Structures are given as C-alpha cells and as structure tokens.
C-alpha cells in the first residue's frame, strides 16, 4: 500500500480529474488508445476500430465509466493494505481472464502522470504516488499469472 501521505497526494491530484468523470473518463481511454494502439485489441467492443470509430461509439462511455469508478475506489483505499489486498487480487484475477497482463499496466503507468497534468498540475510528490499505486497493480498481475 501507499502511506497516508502518499495516498493524500494521489487523491489531491485525482480530484480535479474525477470532477468531470464522464468527459475525463472518455479522454483517458482515448489517450491510452492513441499512445498504445495494441491496447484496443483486448477490448471486444473496440478491436480493429480506429480512434475515430472508438470516439464515435455509443459503447465508450460504458467502458470508460466503469474504469474511472474502480480507479476512484483504488485512490480512496490506497493507504489501507488490507483493502488493497482484496482489491488487487480481484482486479488482477479479472484482468488476466481477459488476457490483460502487467505489460499493459506498465503502459498505463507511463502515460498516467501526463494525463493527470493535462487536467491540472498535480502537487509535488503526486507523480511518484501514482507510479507506486500502478506498481502495486503491476505486481498483482504478475502474481495472477501475467
Ligand atoms: C487504468 C486502470 C484500469 C481499471 C481501473 C480497469 C477497470 C476495469 C473494470 C472495473 C472492469 C469490469 C467492468 C464491468 O464489466 O463491470 C474492466 C474490464 C475490462 N478491462 Fe480493465 N481496467 C483498467 C485498465 C485496463 C487496460 C489497460 C486494459 C486493456 C489494455 C483493460 C481491459 C479490460 C477488458 C478487456 C475488460 C473486459 C470488459 C469488456 O471489455 O467488456 N483494462 N476494467
């Protein structure tokens, strides 16, 4: 888990992003697809489609919303190793079943700080807190088998 201090920094940086959940959630998915094209292929709903096609899809909101909803939960419980344990396990288990592994998360981790900064400058230390949180997710994926 993250420390209380680290967790607070992540929460602080996330707030402005989550303020506009719908628009920001869609934008995150789109930025992911643009920077890491192969990522779309894992999605039944977006495999083979171009970014323009994805943007125009009535399914985008459903997928993006579920992701943001869960990320918010990770941010909220990040400082509680216990809650994290369960969340991580479950998260990893679910992802692996879909064929998603740690490599994909390594990509999310690389682009995340930049995405946040595009909404509002994050406080000092927030970047390192996100990397640590993603690190925890990456570790979980590896234990889950991928
Ligand atoms: C930023 C971190 C992400 C979070 C918090 C997240 C969260 C979730 C959640 C909560 C679900 C289940 C939705 C439901 O059916 O209720 C889901 C499904 C799924 N996720 Fe993730 N995910 C993340 C990143 C990724 C990445 C990087 C990929 C692929 C590269 C991915 C691929 C999938 C796939 C294929 C499904 C199956 C649902 C479907 O596509 O119909 N996720 N995700």
Distance (Å, whole) CA 101 – CA 98: 9
CATH number at residue 79: 1.10.490.10
Distance (Å, whole) CA 111 – CA 48: 22
What is the domain count for the chain? 1
Cα(60) to centroid(ligand 1), Å: 12
What is the Rg, in whole angstroms, of the alpha carbon atoms belonging to the chain? 15
Q: Which atom of ligand 1 is nearest to the CA of 38?
A: 30
Q: Are 13 and 123 in contact (CB under 8 A)?
A: yes
CA angle at 90 for the pair 89 and 96, rounded to the nearest 5°: 90
Q: Which atom of ligand 1 is nearest to the CA of 107?
A: 27
Neighbours of 97 (CB within 10 A): 10
Cα(100) to centroid(ligand 1), Å: 9
Header resolution in angstroms: 1.6
Cα(1) to centroid(ligand 1), Å: 21
Going by alpha carbons, the residue nearest to atom 34 of ligand 1 is: 43
Owning domain of residue 15: 1-146
């Amino acid at each position: 888990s993250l420390s209380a201090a680290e967790a607070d920094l992540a929460g602080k940086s996330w707030a402005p992003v989550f303020a506009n959940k719908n628009a920001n959630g869609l934008d995150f998915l789109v930025a992911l697809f643009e920077k890491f094209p192969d990522s779309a292929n894992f999605f039944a709903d977006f495999k083979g489609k171009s970014v323009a096609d994805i943007k125009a899809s009535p399914k985008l909101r459903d997928v993006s919303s579920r992701i943001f909803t869960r990320l918010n939960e990770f941010v909220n419980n990040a400082a509680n190793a216990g809650k994290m344990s369960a969340m991580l396990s479950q998260f990893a288990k679910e992802h692996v079943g879909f064929g998603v592994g740690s490599a994909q998360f390594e990509n999310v981790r690389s682009m995340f700080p930049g995405f946040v900064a595009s909404v509002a400058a994050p406080p000092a230390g927030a970047d390192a807190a996100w990397t640590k949180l993603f690190g925890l997710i990456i570790d979980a994926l590896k234990a889950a088998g991928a």
